[PDB]
Amino acid sequence: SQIQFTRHASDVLLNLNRLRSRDILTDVVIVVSREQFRAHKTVLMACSGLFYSIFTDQLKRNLSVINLDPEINPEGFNILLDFMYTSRLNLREGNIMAVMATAMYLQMEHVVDTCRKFIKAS
Amino acid sequence: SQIQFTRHASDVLLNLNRLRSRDILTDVVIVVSREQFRAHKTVLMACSGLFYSIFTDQLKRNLSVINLDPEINPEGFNILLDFMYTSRLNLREGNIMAVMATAMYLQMEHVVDTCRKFIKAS
Ligand SMILES: Cc1cc(-c2cn(CC(=O)Nc3cc(N4CCOCC4)ncc3Cl)c3ncn(CC#Cc4cnn(C)c4)c(=O)c23)cc(C#N)c1O
Ligand SMILES: Cc1cc(-c2cn(CC(=O)Nc3cc(N4CCOCC4)ncc3Cl)c3ncn(CC#Cc4cnn(C)c4)c(=O)c23)cc(C#N)c1O
């Protein structure tokens, strides 16, 4: 019975990305080898099984720094972080393997499955 | 050139609402007369000109309690808060005026315009 606003969720996500771009209310830095990326824990939890499992635990919920596995490619992480905030996944031949492995680690199944589709289509 | 995930933003918003329902990483209580509502400031900012203007200001960004105008109907606020987190607006004959006035106060134009449409259609 409710009126549905079909662009609202996309508009929210765009505004959340705008807040990230201005470092407004970001509450964690994710450290990936020599690079650092600020984010909102709520968005990370919404998009990643790894981050969900980390921050749901009261033991870890208040952490302000998360150090990822040093084997994780920073570019691959950046691609996925941008995906979380945009719904747009930049997959190429040159990044597919890194992106797929990073998405497995972050526990992002739809991206992993899309990577499998990308592989099949080339 | 990016692959588009058409359900991702909706899925993010659903997960943010799930976090709200469990009081996970909520960072503000909004006080509306005798009622209180917990939320994520980032979502409020993403959906409301009033909350955007409040929390962007470094003077007010860290506030944990916001007291709304005592004239604001708590039910009307609740309807709009649920809209922010769901994209679904519960407009009825019995709540339209309160919802419209609350949306004006919260600076949520698309809802206000939809309220104007609802009035025109009855
Ligand atoms: C929106 C979105 C979410 C997830 C995704 C999020 N999460 C975390 C999660 O589930 N969070 C929440 C769950 C609930 N619940 C609802 C009520 O019932 C219980 C849960 N409530 C609030 C939050 Cl924040 C994910 N967690 C796991 N996976 C799966 C995976 C994987 C994988 C791939 N390879 N490997 C090794 C593992 C997800 O995809 C997401 C992945 C993608 C992708 N790709 C995506 O576009
Ligand atoms: C997604 C969504 C947003 C807004 C809405 C949000 N905001 C706050 C805002 O604009 N936040 C941000 C803006 C930017 N910028 C992008 C780059 O350029 C600058 C801005 N970046 C990040 C954030 Cl969080 C709104 N603020 C104002 N209004 C308009 C109004 C009104 C009104 C109605 N009656 N009265 C008296 C006032 C909005 O609708 C929204 C309203 C609705 C509705 N209905 C809706 O479904």
Curated annotation (Swiss-Prot), chains A, B:
Expressed, tissue-wise, as follows: Expressed in germinal center T- and B-cells and in primary immature dendritic cells.
Location comes to:
Nucleus
The PTM entry states: Phosphorylated by ATM in response to genotoxic stress. Phosphorylation induces its degradation by ubiquitin/proteasome pathway.
In the record, which residues are listed under signal peptide? Answer: none
- The BTB domain covers which part of the protein? 26-93
Tell me what happens on changing S53A: Abolished ubiquitination by the SCF(FBXL17) complex
The stated induction of this gene product is: Down-regulated during maturation of dendritic cells by selective stimuli such as bacterial lipopolysaccharides (LPS), CD40LG and zymosan. Protein levels decreases upon genotoxic stress in a dose- and time-dependent way.
Entry comment, domain topic: The BTB domain mediates homodimerization. Its dimer interface mediates peptide binding such as to corepressors BCOR and NCOR2. Interaction with corepressors through the BTB domain is needed to facilitate the rapid proliferation and survival of GC B-cells but is not involved in the T(FH) formation and BCL6-mediated suppression of T(H)2 and T(H)17 differentiationrequired for GC formation.
Q: Any idea what job this protein has?
A: Transcriptional repressor mainly required for germinal center (GC) formation and antibody affinity maturation which has different mechanisms of action specific to the lineage and biological functions. Forms complexes with different corepressors and histone deacetylases to repress the transcriptional expression of different subsets of target genes. Represses its target genes by binding directly to the DNA sequence 5'-TTCCTAGAA-3' (BCL6-binding site) or indirectly by repressing the transcriptional activity of transcription factors.
Q: Which disease is it linked to?
A: Chromosomal aberrations involving BCL6 are a cause of B-cell non-Hodgkin lymphomas (B-cell NHL), including diffuse large B-cell lymphoma and follicular lymphoma. Approximately 40% of diffuse large B-cell lymphomas and 5 to 10% of follicular lymphomas are associated with chromosomal translocations that deregulate expression of BCL6 by juxtaposing heterologous promoters to the BCL6 coding domain. Translocation t(3;14)(q27;q32). Translocation t(3;22)(q27;q11) with immunoglobulin gene regions. Translocation t(3;7)(q27;p12) with IKZF1 gene 5'non-coding region. A chromosomal aberration involving BCL6 may be a cause of a form of B-cell leukemia. Translocation t(3;11)(q27;q23) with POU2AF1/OBF1.
What's the subunit arrangement here?
Homodimer. Interacts (via BTB domain) with the corepressors BCOR, NCOR1 and SMRT/NCOR2; the interactions are direct. Forms preferably ternary complexes with BCOR and SMRT/NCOR2 on target gene promoters but, on enhancer elements, interacts with SMRT/NCOR2 and HDAC3 to repress proximal gene expression. Interacts with histone deacetylases HDAC2, HDAC5 and HDAC9 (via the catalytic domain). Interacts with ZBTB7 and BCL6B. Interacts with SCF(FBXO11) complex; the interaction is independent of phosphorylation and promotes ubiquitination.
Under what name is this protein listed?
A: B-cell lymphoma 6 protein
Q: What is the lineage of its organism?
A: Eukaryota, Metazoa, Chordata, Craniata, Vertebrata
Covered residues, full protein: 7 to 128 of 706
